């Protein structure tokens, strides 16, 4: 296949060229008007960057009315997204090799994006490898199962290891006392339970032992913080970077925690409910500026989805979290059409920084395995859920109007049509 009149995303400047894909799905070359006798498929001068990295999903295994691997990924496909990174919580969670591997063979048998496996970290579990795990998810609250680190006390045995470490970072003794002070009433006493502080203080117990491990130790450790949502855990983190020598800190942030607030709970109702909860607007204000200041390196969907009659019902029964893999794509490069953050950035937060965090390489070379994705950057149109593929057809940003979308995927060397491209 030949992707004629492309604009292509390489090293780090926009070029452009065809992009020849061989009959292995791998990129044989990329030249200024290829002439060769294959099937010619005119990208018009749309972008075509490495493949987007959605480094925090939820295909909610073992749960597959709420989505599955081929729902997952069709979904993936329609966002523009060539990898996902799937998160361990699942029922049962994924806390024994036996549990991984049967999982994984699920997983190969209907995936159609490339899809990784995270292992799932108990106070039990802690010691093992899993060879084909991408990262070890820590759950510092409870989520399934024993995935949960109820004994903080143990934090520094657990990072004390050369893993790559995904923390969700809440403060179960935070929660706790608020539990004690505020009644689950409406959607805003969600935020004020599960409140900042509760977020920025498991932060801090995660960083005080990074210090005795950096300096006590010769392990060194990868902790990627997922979802931070607070303008002071992001001031913290920026700020123990300057003190670590051997430890290596990643932030990634979500499309929500950048767009919405507080202010719209009670509008947002169960589409609003997520862990960690809406903050402030400065909180949003702190994270696109970490995006331009390069203190956040990641951004990712934490794509849970759920029962759509489930998120209908009152705060106390509604479970937390929302789809995002759909609309992670237009929602980043909707801030590069406000003048938000450059279209580099975009690039950076969904394609390069993923890629080298996770090891995955999806680099746009000769010889590599073609994992791209082709966006039409001004494209304007309405984000609407009935188009979504996943089995979650709902989202909170339901008929917002942006501008930039994917609109080819492209899988191992194989196109697909993505979301813009029925825009
Ligand atoms: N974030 C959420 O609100 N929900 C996620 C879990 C998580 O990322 O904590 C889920 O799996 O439903
Ligand atoms: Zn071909
Ligand atoms: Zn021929
Ligand atoms: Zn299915
Ligand atoms: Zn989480
Ligand atoms: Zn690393
Ligand atoms: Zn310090
Ligand atoms: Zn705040
Ligand atoms: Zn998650
Ligand atoms: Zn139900
Ligand atoms: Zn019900
Ligand atoms: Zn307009």
Redesign the pocket.
Known sequence: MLLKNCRIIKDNKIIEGDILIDENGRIKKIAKDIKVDDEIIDIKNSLVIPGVIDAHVHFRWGEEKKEDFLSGSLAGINGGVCFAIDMPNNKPPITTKELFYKKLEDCKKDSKINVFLNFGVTENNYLGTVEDAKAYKIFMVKSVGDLFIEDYSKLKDILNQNKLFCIHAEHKDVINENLKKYQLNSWIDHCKIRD?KSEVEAVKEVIKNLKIIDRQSNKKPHVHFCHIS??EALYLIKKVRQELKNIKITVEVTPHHIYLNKDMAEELKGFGKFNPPL??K??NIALIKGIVNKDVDIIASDHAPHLLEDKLKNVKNCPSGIPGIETIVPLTLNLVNKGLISLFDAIRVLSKNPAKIFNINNKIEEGNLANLTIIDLKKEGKINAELFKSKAKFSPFDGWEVKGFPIYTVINGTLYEAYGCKC
């Open positions: 900042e607070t303008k903050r402030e400065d909180d």
